[PDB]
């Protein structure tokens, strides 16, 4: 069946000079959190910014089916921590980067399990 690949389509739209998805809901927090990638409550640290999950999910924002089997979303209802230097495009960050299964931090931005 023809699968509409939107994950790469966005990487192509950006790489060709395109406006990143805005209106991502940034939250007010102490910035003294664990610094983990996805959390039930804002856990941004002094180097991060917390955002509402649903607002940072490409699938939710574009109203399209979710890759995860059953249509389960990993961001809706959670909060995603984004490095301040990459907070201008939270959606693009969640796609490109991956979360460490051990510590629960972003790999290359907090995960030091090696």
């Amino acid at each position: 069946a023809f699968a509409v690949d939107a994950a790469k389509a966005y990487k192509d739209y950006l790489a060709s000079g395109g406006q990143p998805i805005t209106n991502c809901v940034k939250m007010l927090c102490t910035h003294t959190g664990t610094g983990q990638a996805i959390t039930v409550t804002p856990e941004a640290n002094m180097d991060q910014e917390s955002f509402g999950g649903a607002s940072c999910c490409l699938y939710c924002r574009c109203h399209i089916d979710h890759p995860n089997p059953k249509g389960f979303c990993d961001l809706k209802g959670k909060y995603v921590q984004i490095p301040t230097t990459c907070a201008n495009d939270p959606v693009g960050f969640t796609l490109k980067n991956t979360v460490c299964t051990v510590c629960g931090m972003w790999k290359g931005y907090g995960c030091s399990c090696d």
Binding site: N23, V25, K26, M27, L28, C29, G52, S55, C57, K78
Partner: protein
Amino acid sequence: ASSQAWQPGVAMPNLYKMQRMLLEKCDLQNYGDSATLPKGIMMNVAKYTQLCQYLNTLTLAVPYNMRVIHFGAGSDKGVAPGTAVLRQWLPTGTLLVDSDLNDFVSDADSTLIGDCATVHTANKWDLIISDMYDPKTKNVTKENDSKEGFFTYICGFIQQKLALGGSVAIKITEHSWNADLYKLMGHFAWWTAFVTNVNASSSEAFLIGCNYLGKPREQIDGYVMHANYIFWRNTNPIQLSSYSLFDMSKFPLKLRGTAVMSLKEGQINDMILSLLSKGRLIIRENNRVVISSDVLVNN
């Protein structure tokens, strides 16, 4: 800047509630002015953050598996900033349902799209937040009379789906208001009109009903109380402030583990009313939560 600038907002003083003023036009001294918000923070994140900061000082009932419904949660941006704040503020395990006339993505457990009039629910709620506002209210062509529309629904929803001991926060403005809604505030242990310091240059306010008693504790004339609210806003300029936003250490709502009992109208004496009045008790069924949206069908 008076000590009010350090509060999340300002509540209508008791002496203004006891007046009997006639409805005058609202003319704010700073109408139009905008507050300085923390870098990259949306107005509605700041607004809901101050509302929740104020709700923390009230005797809200907070049981395990608390039930919160949020009407008017959508925006022209397609996201729900206010719902994101409620998710942050409410204890984990709290059921949060939001709804709006237009489609939007939310962090709520469940979202209903459509006119609030089409929303049905078998169970009762512990907290109701309404940020509904009809854009047609901006067309003032006659006298400022009591508005109906979604307010009619909200009054019926509170009387039938609000748990005893439950609380409400309904958004109003100079022209977006209802007389029956002010009368219902008299069915709570306590009520007030709350103005956020970040939107102090707006006639906007949240009518807060604290601890629903199910019966009139006070006799309130809606037309008179709205005139009193306008008189208060016209005579008390509030200085725009976002200072309360820079301290989020005590933000989360404390889980009081309030008791939930399924009593009948015959087992409600004065002893029980005093517990409801202190957010020490919630009265409602504790069955599964079922919501539905009516779908009108056309050929």
